[PDB]
Design a protein around this nucleic acid. Sequence first.
RNA 1: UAAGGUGAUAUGAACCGUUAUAACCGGCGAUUUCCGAAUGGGGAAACCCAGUGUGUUUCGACACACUAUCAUUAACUGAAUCCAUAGGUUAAUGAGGCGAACCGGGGGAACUGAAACAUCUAAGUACCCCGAGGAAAAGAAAUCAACCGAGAUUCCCCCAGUAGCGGCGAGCGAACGGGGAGCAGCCCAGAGCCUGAAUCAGUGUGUGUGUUAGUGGAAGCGUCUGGAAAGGCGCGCGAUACAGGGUGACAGCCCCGUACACAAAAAUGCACAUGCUGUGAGCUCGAUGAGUAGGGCGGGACACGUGGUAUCCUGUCUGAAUA
RNA 2: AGGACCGAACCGACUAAUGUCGAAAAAUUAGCGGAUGACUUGUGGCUGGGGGUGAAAGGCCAAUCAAACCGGGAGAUAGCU
RNA 3: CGAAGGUGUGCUGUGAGGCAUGCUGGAGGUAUCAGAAGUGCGAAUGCUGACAUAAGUAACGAUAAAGCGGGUGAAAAGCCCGCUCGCCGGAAGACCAAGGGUUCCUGUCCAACGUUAAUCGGGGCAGGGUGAGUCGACCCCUAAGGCGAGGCCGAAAGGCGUAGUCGAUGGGAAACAGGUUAAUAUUCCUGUACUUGGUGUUACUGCGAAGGGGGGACGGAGAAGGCUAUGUUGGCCGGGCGACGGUUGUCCCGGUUUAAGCGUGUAGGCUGGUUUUCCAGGCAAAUCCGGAAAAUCAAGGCUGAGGCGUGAUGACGAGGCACUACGGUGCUGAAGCAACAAAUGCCCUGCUUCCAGGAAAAGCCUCUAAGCAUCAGGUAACAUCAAAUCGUACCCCAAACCG
Lengths: 17, 17, 46, 63, 93
Amino acid sequence: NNRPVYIPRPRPPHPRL
Amino acid sequence: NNRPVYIPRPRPPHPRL
Amino acid sequence: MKRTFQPSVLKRNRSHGFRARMATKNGRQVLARRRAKGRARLTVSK
Amino acid sequence: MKAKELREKSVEELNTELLNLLREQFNLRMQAASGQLQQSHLLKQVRRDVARVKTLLNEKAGA
Amino acid sequence: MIREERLLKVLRAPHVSEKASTAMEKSNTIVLKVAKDATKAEIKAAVQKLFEVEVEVVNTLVVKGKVKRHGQRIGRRSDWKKAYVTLKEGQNL
RNA sequence: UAAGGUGAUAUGAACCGUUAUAACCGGCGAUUUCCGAAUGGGGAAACCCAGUGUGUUUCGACACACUAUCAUUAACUGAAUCCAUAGGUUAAUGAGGCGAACCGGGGGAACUGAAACAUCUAAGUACCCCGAGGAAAAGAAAUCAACCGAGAUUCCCCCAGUAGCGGCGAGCGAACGGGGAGCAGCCCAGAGCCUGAAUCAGUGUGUGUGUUAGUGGAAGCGUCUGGAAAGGCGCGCGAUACAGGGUGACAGCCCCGUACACAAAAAUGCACAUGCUGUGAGCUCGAUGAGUAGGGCGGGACACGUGGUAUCCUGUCUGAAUA
RNA sequence: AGGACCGAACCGACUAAUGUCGAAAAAUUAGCGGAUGACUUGUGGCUGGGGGUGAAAGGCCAAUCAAACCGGGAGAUAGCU
RNA sequence: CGAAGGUGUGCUGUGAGGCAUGCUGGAGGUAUCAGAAGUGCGAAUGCUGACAUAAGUAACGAUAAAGCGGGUGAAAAGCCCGCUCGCCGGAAGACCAAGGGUUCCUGUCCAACGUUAAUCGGGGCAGGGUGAGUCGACCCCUAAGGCGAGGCCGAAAGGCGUAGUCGAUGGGAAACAGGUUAAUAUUCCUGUACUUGGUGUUACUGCGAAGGGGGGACGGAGAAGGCUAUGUUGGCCGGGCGACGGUUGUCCCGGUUUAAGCGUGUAGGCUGGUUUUCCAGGCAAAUCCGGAAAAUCAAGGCUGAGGCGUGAUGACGAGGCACUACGGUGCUGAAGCAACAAAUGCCCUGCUUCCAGGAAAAGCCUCUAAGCAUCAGGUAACAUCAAAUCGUACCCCAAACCG
């Protein structure tokens, strides 16, 4: 299984998540 | 930051003739 | 207001498609120029 | 193991190639998809083995 | 002959979802992923041999990949094919 | 080569290997989906649909291979008419497409300059088309010179903005000759005598060297400041290695390298030696390129625009001599 | 029967107002013309720039047409600013 | 124990400048004398980026319209639920093609996007979702037109075109009803059907083409007749009699639905049938077509909506009942008829008229040539097998297409 996708560091105006 | 591409034709001037 | 561009997949392919370009030499030259410039989309296609 | 089957005849080497695909290749893929395959290196090992056996078949058969 | 290992390669994985579960419990059908081409005849033959079961019919469909937005780059998921394999009254898995 | 590895964004998971069949690098092989000259037919490229010939668990249905066109050659067939030819089928060989410039040939502008503009210039330039190679083209005098002589072609520097051409306007602009780079001359239009007789081309073996992985490769410590010294201060060492890069500030002596000395199982380039195959010396005698040279008319190339205009080329109409 | 009549869809665009950094790079609102025909419309073809097409306005040919667009000659030329 | 750069101050030269130093900065800088320049900017309606101005001004995109309660939430005029009001209703509703290409559904998030807020969304993130022998494409055939073996023509490129091969906007085999998912169904499920091929068996038989014929196969307008979709009313079944007067009555509300296929084949429309003989036409042939002859009967044949049966004592069905993660789920289920009106839809590629005279080819039917006739092949019946591949979500007069 591959849950981890390694989300990258986003932009200063990025989705708050 | 594209400079305006379409400039409309100038309004016809008043006839000074 | 009917604008100039009225999309149609069939007409688009038959006018600027790969097979249309290769049929005549000038279109072949067009493909050659695109390849030299290294354009990702050589022509129009799905 | 690379030269272990290099001295095998076509029939027997063809058989182990059959077994490699039937078992440890199809079954592993199902386990990985279902999520019960804790260790994934088997898929790499079996795939390379299938390639190694397959090249010997071509090298031996014909040319 | 290479029909054998072809049948060993058309199946890719089983599909798990609430629709898949509902179909299995109600219509006795199992939905599973198959190869890109995976013609119905090949899928039927593969299910017969590997699962030693009997299938009424197989009907397939192609699922187009989604366009996903990773970081500052755009990308498209690979297309794949799923088959609704229908079993008879007697089933094993 | 090797104690580290499983490419990167990019951590992890699960594993491999550590004295050699982990990984990595090089040579030679295998694999090489579909589109694309695309070549089985078609097609809206990455798709659809076939024939034939070989082999196979339920007739079911599959696997492999082949099947484009054109050119040349051969065979088998074969019309209008006997023969024949065209034509048709088969087999073999080659071609096809792409590619930055350079090269040769076939076409060929205008802006612009002349302070306008038409001859002219721009310019045989841009551009289009065809063909070929690693260079191509050109080329062994029906040439120059001057009655002294030079001995194929190409390129560079002079001669020289000279002589000339030119609405003698704008502009274009040589040759002879001199100094250099580099050097090479041969064959067919034909018979005899003598016959591998040299020089070449296509392929083996051996030698030398190069290329595709690589290996070894010298020599510095102590103190001060500082987050950390390669810096300051003191005393040393190597150098056929102070070319470079990295290392917590600027390193000959910390690391990778450099100078230097070595290495190739395998595959290849070049230079030689030695074999095979094919074409071919030398001597005697003879021949010595005809719709050509030249000419009339119309154009082009020659620096040279028809001018007193030689020379070359060509569309058209004519037409010699031959030592 | 009708290039017949009134009139919706549909096609057209005569008048006025609004709108001119507008909702819209010619529209909306209220009226208006044709509406079985020289009608209108979908799909696909053909005509390529000193040309096409034109019940003819130098109109139209991808919001550009008394000679389209793109690239090149080209850093054209400018006794002018 | 602090380079360039940056930011101040103090001095100095006639000027362009120079020098010193504080703070920041953090590792480069460079005297002197020479050499070389992309060697100095304030303007060119200069070019690029950044930031002002107007200015917290105009505007917030149809004058179809909102109000209240409850819920979730940090926060509710905008979200969800409920009760009212309003708007469209030949559309602002419901289905497709074209074109988009996940905008579909569920969970979660509110920075950016939405001309405001936002818990919401066609926004971000993750998962799920497109099921076909019958629908469409593909496929067989062809129109305009394209390409085009040879060929003809042209400085080259290339142009035109025959045989051919492509090209739907046309022709060609087959499915309907009901139910089900948060999201697909004429695809899944249930019920009941249909079509085209392959193989085998049985009983008969002459088969056989890029060849012939038939069919396919066609205009405008107009009219009438017969029907249906559909609607209204009555009957029937179920429920109600009622907060402001009256309402057991001719009262009020709801329901009264069912296909393809198969059978019968009707109104209507078209054509006179059958048998025999002969014929240089159908580029060969022909039992077919066409033509010419007689004999005999006046009738058959073709086409054909709807209706009625079957499909179906099945499905659907108001309502009621039992539990609700309180969205819904499960169970049960009466009547299901008649009359009238009526299409722009069907009979009708019909009929009657008019001049402007209204595609092609294949599938299909039929006759033969070559060739094969103890075969093969064909016909009928039965059995069995096959029907692949691609599209299938969602928008589709619009917030998803072109602007």
